């Protein structure tokens, strides 16, 4: 499944995507991505749209 990450950061804002077999695998990839880019926010996940959102 294609999962989407919506980033609402202080300085970095946009969207990116990743492909994974399940949501937990996608979450790990996105949490690594956020750490690599210096984003430290709160997360939500909406199973209906397969979208994660992170806000600083």
Swiss-Prot record:
<protein>
    <recommendedName>
        <fullName>Immunoglobulin G-binding protein G</fullName>
    </recommendedName>
</protein>
């Amino acid at each position: 499944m294609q999962y989407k990450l919506v980033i609402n950061g202080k300085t970095l804002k946009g969207e990116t995507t990743t492909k994974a077999v399940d949501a937990e695998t996608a979450e790990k990839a996105f949490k690594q991505y956020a750490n690599d880019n210096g984003v430290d926010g709160v997360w939500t996940y909406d199973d209906a749209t397969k979208t994660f959102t992170v806000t600083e």
